[PDB]
Amino acid sequence: EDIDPLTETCVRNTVPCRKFVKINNSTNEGMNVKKCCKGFCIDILKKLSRTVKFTYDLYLVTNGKHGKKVNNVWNGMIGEVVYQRAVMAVGSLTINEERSEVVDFSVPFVETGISVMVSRSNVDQVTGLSDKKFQRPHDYSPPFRFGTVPNGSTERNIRNNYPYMHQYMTKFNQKGVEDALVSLKTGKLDAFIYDAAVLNYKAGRDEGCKLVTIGSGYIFATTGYGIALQKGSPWKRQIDLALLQFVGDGEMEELETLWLTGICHNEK
């Protein structure tokens, strides 16, 4: 968000996060604007910082989004931590073996995984991951649309598992998460594969709940989120035990109920 004109420091319900903004495109004018932002992970960060008494001057990532081993050099938050440029990478980060091999992780707190986003235009629709249809879809009806994005997490797993589905899915590539949803609503897209948690959140507060995920709470590649940490950093045990205590005492559940709640979802 941006600082409101009235008492222009920030709203009393969030934390200032500095960021890098480039004026226009050609001009590399790096006016490091001061703005304040909220969400989910920041709440856990505040709670953790209260119980571990450490200060922080956090900044957004500049080049690229998420992380990828592009030409043996990583961009995004992974590139920062792998270069010892910024301890902690709090955000929606998926646990992966290559990621774990490169940079240490902590234990998860919120579970998620691969989910299938196919709904009824007007008995489960597909209910199959290694199904008959999406294993050789060329010679079965007109080909279905795939929701996928370059430099992600699900696409790499699908490619290394069976590239043929990835080979066809390279035909359809989206730019933004809302772009794929808009195309699906407009009819240009039919199926979307992405992280389970974000798809669940989007479908929960959908306007009218016209779209329902393919499976009734079924996941394929169950793997929770986490926070990246510098290899050998003297923070692992403290933060790990702290958030284990947090999940034990039910603060995470309360925060999920307050935040991770849909519009209709179960209200049917």
């Binding site: 507060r205 306007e207 709640t261 519009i263």
Partner: peptide
């Protein structure tokens, strides 16, 4: 079919909507 809204305690009244 329509339900009575339980004030702000109602989550629907908790989350504003364009039609509300």
């Amino acid at each position: 079919p329509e339900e009575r809204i339980t004030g702000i305690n109602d989550p629907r009244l908790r989350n504003p909507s364009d039609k509300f």
